Amino acid sequence: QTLTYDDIVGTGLANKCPTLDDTARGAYPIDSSQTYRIARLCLQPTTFLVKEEPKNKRQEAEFVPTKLVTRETTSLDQIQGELKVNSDGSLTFVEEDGIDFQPVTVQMAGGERIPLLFTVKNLVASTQPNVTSITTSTDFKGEFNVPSYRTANFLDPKGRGLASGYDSAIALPQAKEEELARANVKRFSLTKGQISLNVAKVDGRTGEIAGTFESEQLSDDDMGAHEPHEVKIQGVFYASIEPA
Amino acid sequence: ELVNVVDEKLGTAYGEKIDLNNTNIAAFIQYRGLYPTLAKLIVKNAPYESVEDVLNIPGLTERQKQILRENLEHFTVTEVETALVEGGDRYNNGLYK
Amino acid sequence: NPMWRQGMFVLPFMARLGVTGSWSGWSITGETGIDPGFWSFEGVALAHIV
Amino acid sequence: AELTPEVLTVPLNSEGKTITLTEKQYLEGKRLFQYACASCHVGGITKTNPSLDLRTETLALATPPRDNIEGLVDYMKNPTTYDGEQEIAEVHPSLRSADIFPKMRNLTEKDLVAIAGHILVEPKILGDKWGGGKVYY
Amino acid sequence: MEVNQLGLIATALFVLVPSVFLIILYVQTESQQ
Amino acid sequence: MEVNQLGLIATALFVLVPSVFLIILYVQTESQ
Amino acid sequence: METITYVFIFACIIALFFFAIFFREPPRIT
Amino acid sequence: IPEKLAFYDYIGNNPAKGGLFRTGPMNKGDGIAQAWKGHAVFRNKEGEELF
Amino acid sequence: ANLWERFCNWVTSTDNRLYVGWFGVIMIPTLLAATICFVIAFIAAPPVDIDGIREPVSGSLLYGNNIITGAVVPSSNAIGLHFYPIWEAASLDEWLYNGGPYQLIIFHFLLGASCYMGRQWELSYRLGMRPWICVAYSAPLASAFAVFLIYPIGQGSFSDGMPLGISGTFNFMIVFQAEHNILMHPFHQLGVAGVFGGALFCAMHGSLVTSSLIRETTETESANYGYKFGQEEETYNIVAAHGYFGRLIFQYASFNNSRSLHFFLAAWPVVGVWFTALGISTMAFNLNGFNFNHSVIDAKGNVINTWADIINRANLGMEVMHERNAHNFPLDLA
Amino acid sequence: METLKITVYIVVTFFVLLFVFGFLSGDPARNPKRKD
Numbered sequence A: 001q002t003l004t005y006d007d008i009v010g011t012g013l014a015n016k017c018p019t020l021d022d023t024a025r026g027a028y029p030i031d032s033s034q035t036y037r038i039a040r041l042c043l044q045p046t047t048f049l050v051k052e053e054p055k056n057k058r059q060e061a062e063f064v065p066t067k068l069v070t071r072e073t074t075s076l077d078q079i080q081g082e083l084k085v086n087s088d089g090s091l092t093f094v095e096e097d098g099i100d101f102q103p104v105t106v107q108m109a110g111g112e113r114i115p116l117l118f119t120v121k122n123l124v125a126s127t128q129p130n131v132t133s134i135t136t137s138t139d140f141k142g143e144f145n146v147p148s149y150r151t152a153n154f155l156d157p158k159g160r161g162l163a164s165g166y167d168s169a170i171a172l173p174q175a176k177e178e179e180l181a182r183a184n185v186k187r188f189s190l191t192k193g194q195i196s197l198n199v200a201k202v203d204g205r206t207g208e209i210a211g212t213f214e215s216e217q218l219s220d221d222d223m224g225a226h227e228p229h230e231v232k233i234q235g236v237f238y239a240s241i242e243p244a
Numbered sequence B: 001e002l003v004n005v006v007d008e009k010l011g012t013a014y015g016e017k018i019d020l021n022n023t024n025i026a027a028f029i030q031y032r033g034l035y036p037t038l039a040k041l042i043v044k045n046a047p048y049e050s051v052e053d054v055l056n057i058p059g060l061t062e063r064q065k066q067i068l069r070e071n072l073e074h075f076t077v078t079e080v081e082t083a084l085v086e087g088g089d090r091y092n093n094g095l096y097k
Numbered sequence C: 001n002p003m004w005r006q007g008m009f010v011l012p013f014m015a016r017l018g019v020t021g022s023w024s025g026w027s028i029t030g031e032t033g034i035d036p037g038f039w040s041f042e043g044v045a046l047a048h049i050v
Numbered sequence D: 001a002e003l004t005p006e007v008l009t010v011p012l013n014s015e016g017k018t019i020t021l022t023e024k025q026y027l028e029g030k031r032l033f034q035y036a037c038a039s040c041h042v043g044g045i046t047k048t049n050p051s052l053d054l055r056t057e058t059l060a061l062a063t064p065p066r067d068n069i070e071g072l073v074d075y076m077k078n079p080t081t082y083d084g085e086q087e088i089a090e091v092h093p094s095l096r097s098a099d100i101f102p103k104m105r106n107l108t109e110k111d112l113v114a115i116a117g118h119i120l121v122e123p124k125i126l127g128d129k130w131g132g133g134k135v136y137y
Numbered sequence E: 001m002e003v004n005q006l007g008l009i010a011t012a013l014f015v016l017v018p019s020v021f022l023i024i025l026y027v028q029t030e031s032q033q
Numbered sequence F: 001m002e003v004n005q006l007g008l009i010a011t012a013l014f015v016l017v018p019s020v021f022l023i024i025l026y027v028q029t030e031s032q
Numbered sequence G: 001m002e003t004i005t006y007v008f009i010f011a012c013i014i015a016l017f018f019f020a021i022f023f024r025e026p027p028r029i030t
Numbered sequence H: 001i002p003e004k005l006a007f008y009d010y011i012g013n014n015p016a017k018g019g020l021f022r023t024g025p026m027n028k029g030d031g032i033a034q035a036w037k038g039h040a041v042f043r044n045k046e047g048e049e050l051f
Numbered sequence I: 001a002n003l004w005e006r007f008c009n010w011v012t013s014t015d016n017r018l019y020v021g022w023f024g025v026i027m028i029p030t031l032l033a034a035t036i037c038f039v040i041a042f043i044a045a046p047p048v049d050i051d052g053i054r055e056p057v058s059g060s061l062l063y064g065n066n067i068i069t070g071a072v073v074p075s076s077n078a079i080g081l082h083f084y085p086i087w088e089a090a091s092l093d094e095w096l097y098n099g100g101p102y103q104l105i106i107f108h109f110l111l112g113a114s115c116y117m118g119r120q121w122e123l124s125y126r127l128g129m130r131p132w133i134c135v136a137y138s139a140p141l142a143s144a145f146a147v148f149l150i151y152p153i154g155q156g157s158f159s160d161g162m163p164l165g166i167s168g169t170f171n172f173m174i175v176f177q178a179e180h181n182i183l184m185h186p187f188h189q190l191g192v193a194g195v196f197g198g199a200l201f202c203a204m205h206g207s208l209v210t211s212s213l214i215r216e217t218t219e220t221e222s223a224n225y226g227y228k229f230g231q232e233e234e235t236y237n238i239v240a241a242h243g244y245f246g247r248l249i250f251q252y253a254s255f256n257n258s259r260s261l262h263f264f265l266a267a268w269p270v271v272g273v274w275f276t277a278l279g280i281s282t283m284a285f286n287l288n289g290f291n292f293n294h295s296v297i298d299a300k301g302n303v304i305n306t307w308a309d310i311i312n313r314a315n316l317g318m319e320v321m322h323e324r325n326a327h328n329f330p331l332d333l334a
Numbered sequence J: 001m002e003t004l005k006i007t008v009y010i011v012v013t014f015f016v017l018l019f020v021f022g023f024l025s026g027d028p029a030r031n032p033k034r035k036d
């Protein structure tokens, strides 16, 4: 028994990943030979934390909590990729495709909006060696790519862009442009992020697994205009395994 | 020290030939027999170290290898430019007519 | 950079009797992510206008 | 300026033979083109795939060459992709697919020639406008 | 915002001088009847 | 001189407001 | 300072509204 | 070429380039002219002069 | 003497300084809700992601606007025509980002304005008046429904109803022209005729009465003191006004019946503005102004441009620039 | 939020019923001439 679109539509359940029975404490074993894919990886964030900028030299700022303002638009889903068995029995997941990004803006205390591209683009995530079974103590660790939040065609409010748009501040024709280079010259950032996936529930019959994830990445730098913030994303995940 | 990478890219062979590593897929219509089929393939299998690497695309029929040879002089390869390949922009870069 | 360096005159009389936080999530103790309810600096000010 | 035989004269085939349309044929093809084609090809663009237009230089580089009556009449019967590699009668109006594209049903053979003639003549009249898009409106 | 400083004085006088003129004529009108 | 540019508006209103007060009281006196 | 000026003027208009309605010269017949 | 004559050939002294609420002297806009930089000549890679 | 009856008598009393009435019972709370939220939002609302593309537009004074640039920004295109009350948001911070205040303000105002029209009927009845002033007012009211409700309904989003600000108004009318060619639409042309003609006849009527005032005063006093509120005799000579204006044009193009004349004053701008409200209301369903682009061509078939084609070059510049990051496909179909 | 929602439903309902019952209360008769 499962739900249909018309049962889901407008509930918010569309933004929630599938869950596993609290009874599902099994194990899914790995034939060193036979090959495996992940047919659906789903990541549902629950918490967004931003690193403060502590002004001084030895205070190291806190991760503070934020209010989401972009509503139930946050989840990655339909992600798929190879799941490899390495020489030493570690498993490596290689993301291929899926809805693997969501723009998000959270709001810090005091009103500052922080946008970010919550993503796992190009994720490669490995386990410990000598796995031989996925269990309620398997941990995946890996890193991914975080492209620029806007892509190259994006025009700022004065028409300036990277692959399109004006190359100067046309409203200030005889102004000195040195002050304005950072805002006139757009840059396409490309950074890396890190993620931990902790498996806590495992259906040995069906190959489904689920658990918790923590991700660290950078926020939007507005095409070079300003410095990014560090973001920590916590939530829950769900993945399904198939022999390839 | 702040450069526009796309403008900088127009000063390379990318500004004069089809860059097999960067150029949007609609450029493969300027020369015959290349679109959509070979173009689909060149893009999917990018990036290339040299122009002549496209002949080693698996699955190529001898007729296909013949069109690519016919057109190698219209291709180049420069370094992959993140800003031209992210966002699926090699398949749709937002330009229509 | 506490309030008394920024020429705040009435802010400390609100703080004195218990009004410590803002509808925008900050408190003058520096604690982030606080919900003061109605009796924030904002609502105190609103109530005097009304 | 006027609609002279030299403008109404277009390639018949790739050999290099020519045919001179009549004013009638030209206006016949324009009308038929609005009836069966302009919904997607108004002004020589392709609203549903703007990367392919009806300019003569684009048609010339299609496989097989389509800058002539024979190629265009053929395309209206058995349309292919630009490289000739796959037949696309299932998604492009054609006599081959007049069952799913009912407007092609009452097109005769001489209608096809009038339409191909219009497509080849209009660029000679309108220039860059034909297939150029809104920039040239 | 980087705004014209004299805008303030200009606005105040623009309001104050014409307004004060009307009040002067109103009050001395009421004191007649 | 790098003066306080709020000084101009302070001085202007320092003068205008109380002067207007006086003028208003005087004129309505003369009209009764 | 611009914000305060804009709102100050807007506030004076609202006050003026109040007096023009409730403290008007009351029209008197003939 | 005397600088004075070159300075006339500059749209910033065109009176039809201002604004109603753009106040003050022309110098408050483009600044106080200090020097003629020279007459700029553009050429392409083929050495054609360009305008 | 009963409690409900005494309430009903106070609601409908002709002795309150401002009439309340049953329509008033709904108008007052809704106009206050809309007004108060408007004032606070205009001064202090943070930026709003009108077009649903995570590109917030700042509309309030404290976020760097002046009186001319400020606005309550329309709600997000992500919401479309969905109802977005405060209690549907996870928080006020979310509601502010997505533009909740706009919906609150417009729905309360349209309700309260509708009751304003009803109130005009109602007091007319209590005072023994004829009833149709409210019909005059339906013209402006209709106009407000068109830009805040009907056009959003036809286009699928409140992001496309008119901003509540001065520069946002201009944005809305430029984009309308690009997409609908409103200038070339006859119903808009009748609006201009109703508005220009209204201003003309306003000036005419005011200058004719003013020209024919009967001498009742000296050079040293406002002529206005020649009329005393509630006097029974007329204060001007209409036969003199008729005699001047009839000769200015010709006799039979001038009114000597003051009832006909005043009805004519009422009908011309009311009807013109009904039509212009209808213009917005039907262009909401994309039945746009006349299109004569390339209608004139020569013997060969060259396009011979007209002023319509020049207008089209302008419309095109508006088209291609508006909401410059929000279109991913070649046709802007809504 | 749920408390806000209840409150508004209550406030609105109240005003709408004042309106409905106000006009049901013999509105034709509240004019200056003929009462019935």
Ligand SMILES: CCCCCCCCCCCCCCCCCC(=O)OC[C@H](CO[C@@H]1O[C@H](CO[C@H]2O[C@H](CO)[C@H](O)[C@H](O)[C@H]2O)[C@H](O)[C@H](O)[C@H]1O)OC(=O)CCCCCCCCCCCCCCCCC
Binding pocket: A110, A111, A112, C023, C024, C035, C037, C038, C042, C046, C050, I032, I036, I046, I091, I092, I093, I096, J001, J003, J004, J007, J011
């Ligand atoms: C002319 C004559 C006419 C008659 C005159 C009538 C006189 C009455 C005039 C009314 C004046 C209204 C004043 C405006 C009120 C708006 C206050 C607001 O919205 O303020 C509400 C505050 C604001 O909330 C805070 O609002 C903040 C909003 O932030 C924003 O605001 C910040 C502060 O500016 C910064 O700008 C920040 O960057 C920006 O994001 C945060 O989101 C906080 O988390 C959030 O708590 O909330 C609170 O706690 C409020 C309590 C809600 C708690 C939940 C219980 C629900 C209670 C239901 C309410 C009942 C309503 C009464 C009707 C009953 C009828 C019998």
Ligand code: CLA
Binding pocket: H020, H021, H022, H023, H024, H025
């Ligand atoms: C013909 C009159 C005239 C002219 C052409 C000039 C021209 C000039 N003056 Mg001079 N000036 C004048 C009169 C004039 N001045 C007078 C009478 C005074 C005394 C107040 C001054 C005091 C003065 C000073 C102190 C300075 C100048 C400066 C300047 C220069 C800048 C002007 C500027 O920014 O404009 C600004 C113009 C406007 C913003 C337009 C304002 C018009 C408003 C909008 C009209 C109001 C509309 C009204 C309310 C409508 C309601 C009607 C309805 C209700 C019925 C320029 C060469 C400046 C300069 O550079 O000198 C070194 C400078 O600093 N002038």
Ligand code: CLA
Binding pocket: I113, I139, I140, I141, I142, I143, I144, I146, I147, I172, I173, I174, I175, I176, I177, I182, I183, I188, I190, I191, I192, I195, I196, I273, I276, I277, I278, I279, I280
């Ligand atoms: C000479 C040039 C010219 C002229 C004369 C007009 C004239 C007009 N245009 Mg066109 N327009 C023009 C050029 C022109 N336009 C151009 C160049 C463009 C394209 C850029 C347009 C685009 C255009 C659009 C897109 C629209 C118009 C509309 C209109 C009408 C606006 C007035 C109106 O709607 O009244 C109607 C009356 C009102 C809107 C008033 C409603 C008032 C409510 C009921 C009450 C308000 C209460 C208030 C908030 C509080 C007051 C209380 C106080 C105490 C504060 C009018 C017929 C509008 C129209 O037809 O509207 C239907 C419209 O939407 N025009």
Ligand SMILES: CC(C)=CCC/C(C)=C/CC/C(C)=C\CC/C(C)=C/CC/C(C)=C/CC/C(C)=C/CC/C(C)=C/CC/C(C)=C\CC/C(C)=C/CC1=CC(=O)C(C)=C(C)C1=O
Binding pocket: I201, I204, I205, I206, I208, I209, I238, I241, I242, I245, I246, I249, I253, I254, I255, I256, I261, I264
């Ligand atoms: C080479 C050679 C020699 C060539 C030969 C050329 C040759 C020599 C030519 C020479 C020509 C010649 C010698 C001259 C004769 C030419 C001639 C007769 C030409 C006609 C000229 C012409 C263009 C005239 C313009 C006509 C015109 C524009 C008028 C139209 C009027 C009009 C539409 C008005 C609207 C009126 C309206 C609808 C209602 C009234 C308005 C209004 C409601 C007012 C309010 C109001 C009204 C009242 O009424 C009263 C009472 C009161 C109270 C009041 O409130």
Ligand code: HEC
Binding pocket: D033, D036, D037, D038, D039, D040, D041, D046, D048, D049, D052, D053, D054, D055, D058, D059, D062, D066, D072, D075, D076, D080, D081, D082, D088, D092, D093, D115
């Ligand atoms: C939309 C429903 C269309 C209608 C109606 C017609 N055509 Fe079309 N055409 C359409 C598409 C999407 C494409 C591209 C097909 C592809 O993937 O290659 C085309 C292509 C053509 C071409 C080839 C152009 C070229 O540059 O090689 C021609 C000559 C052509 N179409 C002609 C044509 C005629 C004559 C039509 C009416 C009878 C007609 N098309 C209708 C979409 C649509």
Ligand SMILES: CC1=C(/C=C/C(C)=C/C=C/C(C)=C/C=C/C=C(C)/C=C/C=C(C)/C=C/C2=C(C)CCCC2(C)C)C(C)(C)CCC1
Binding pocket: C049, C050
């Ligand atoms: C100058 C000076 C001085 C003095 C000063 C003063 C004295 C001040 C005052 C001031 C003040 C004293 C202020 C006030 C303000 C107020 C306000 C700001 C208010 C507002 C209100 C409102 C807005 C309301 C509204 C309403 C109504 C009316 C009804 C209903 C309800 C409501 C609420 C809505 C000194 C000595 C220090 C010295 C220095 C200088």
Ligand code: OEY
Binding pocket: I051, I077, I155, I159, I160, I175, I179, I322, I323, I326, I332, I333, I334
């Ligand atoms: O005109 Mn152009 O169309 Ca009616 O939507 Mn499509 O773009 Mn956008 O949101 Mn406002 O605006």
Ligand SMILES: [Cl-]
Binding pocket: I171, I175, I321, I322, I323, I324
């Ligand atoms: Cl726009």
Ligand SMILES: [Cl-]
Binding pocket: I326, I327, I328, I329
């Ligand atoms: Cl789109």
